[PDB]
Amino acid sequence: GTQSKPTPVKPNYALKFTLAGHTKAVSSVKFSPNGEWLASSSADKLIKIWGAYDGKFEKTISGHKLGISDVAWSSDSNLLVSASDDKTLKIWDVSSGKCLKTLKGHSNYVFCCNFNPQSNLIVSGSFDESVRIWDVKTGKCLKTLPAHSDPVSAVHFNRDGSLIVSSSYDGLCRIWDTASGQCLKTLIDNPPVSFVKFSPNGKYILAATLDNTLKLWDYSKGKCLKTYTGHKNEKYCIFANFSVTGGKWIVSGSEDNLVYIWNLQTKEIVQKLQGHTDVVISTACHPTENIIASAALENDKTIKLWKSDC
Ligand SMILES: Cc1cccc(C(=O)Nc2cc(-c3ccc4c(c3)CCO4)ccc2N2CCN(C)CC2)c1
Numbered sequence: 238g239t240q241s242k243p244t245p246v247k248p249n250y251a252l253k254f255t256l257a258g259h260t261k262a263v264s265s266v267k268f269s270p271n272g273e274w275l276a277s278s279s280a281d282k283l284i285k286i287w288g289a290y291d292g293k294f295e296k297t298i299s300g301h302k303l304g305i306s307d308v309a310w311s312s313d314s315n316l317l318v319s320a321s322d323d324k325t326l327k328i329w330d331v332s333s334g335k336c337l338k339t340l341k342g343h344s345n346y347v348f349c350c351n352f353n354p355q356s357n358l359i360v361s362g363s364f365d366e367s368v369r370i371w372d373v374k375t376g377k378c379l380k381t382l383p384a385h386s387d388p389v390s391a392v393h394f395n396r397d398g399s400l401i402v403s404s405s406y407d408g409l410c411r412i413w414d415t416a417s418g419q420c421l422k423t424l425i426d427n428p429p430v431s432f433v434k435f436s437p438n439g440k441y442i443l444a445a446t447l448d449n450t451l452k453l454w455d456y457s458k459g460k461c462l463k464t465y466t467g468h469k470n471e472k473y474c475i476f477a478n479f480s481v482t483g484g485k486w487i488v489s490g491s492e493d494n495l496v497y498i499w500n501l502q503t504k505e506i507v508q509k510l511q512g513h514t515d516v517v518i519s520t521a522c523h524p525t526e527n528i529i530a531s532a533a534l535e536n537d538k539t540i541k542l543w544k545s546d547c
Pocket residue numbers: 262263264265279280281304305306307348349388389390391406473474475476518519
């Protein structure tokens with residue numbers, strides 16, 4: 238555009254590939270940190286690996302005895318961890334597909350998992366209301382945090398692994414010191430907190446609550462900076478993201494089968510992506526390219542890859 242009448246930055250995500258193969262609801266999609274792969278987890282008890290740029294099916298990883306709610310990559314893209322209804326997490330060698338460790342400790346469904354950036358630790362969240370911290374090398378549980386008084390919906394390490402953020406159906410978001418296991422901040426108001434993650438910087442958290450609201454928090458200050466609405470979220474633990482490769486967006490799934498994209502600053506809905514035929518429970522943003530992956534529930538069972546110019 239021009240200096241006097243500038244072109245507003247609005248994304249133009251368009252559907253590129255639909256990835257079919259899971260035989261039940263898909264729970265989670267994650268891009269490998271090296272940008273090459275997408276991993277998906279499903280109620281079909283399987284993990285599948287796909288080409289990030291071409292949607293090509295790569296491999297099926299099996300071993301869990303019940304449905305899988307989450308999958309996460311190690312920082313060098315060599316390992317995966319998965320969280321399952323069978324009360325365990327498993328660590329997987331990406332190359333061979335083999336189960337390297339089974340992480341035993343949780344007393345009920347495991348819903349969420351992540352490696353720390355150093356990738357010597359895994360954090361998990363469970364229906365059993367605990368957050369657990371595990372040694373990657375040994376598969377041993379190092380700490381059981383008495384984290385919440387209701388199911389844990391999300392767990393995330395910050396950029397240097399020194400903090401963990403957790404969210405729960407108890408209505409709280411908590412910030413934990415990785416080393417000590419101590420709670421350093423509680424955000425409290427509240428409906429169930431269905432999702433949380435740290436900003437790419439680490440200075441902010443983004444939290445979803447089951448009142449159709451996403452909020453951007455300055456956690457240390459305890460001040461809510463932004464609110465994002467216009468989507469439907471009153472039931473499912475829907476995964477949202479910071480999109481920072483091009484323009485600065487917030488991306489989320491929705492119970493009206495759409496992917497919503499907001500301008501992070503203006504809180505305005507800049508795009509709504511149509512195509513899925515059930516609740517979009519998971520979104521992921523590619524580490525380097527303007528690529529969104531989205532995944533949907535039982536009436537859909539597919540992953541979609543969307544590409545933008547900004
Ligand atoms: C096997 C499978 C397939 C499709 C969806 C789900 C599911 O909805 N997961 C789940 C359930 C609950 C959950 C919460 C409360 C509760 C239940 C489940 C049953 C009774 O009360 C909380 C979190 C999650 N996660 C977190 C990770 N995310 C990437 C996905 C969704 C699971």
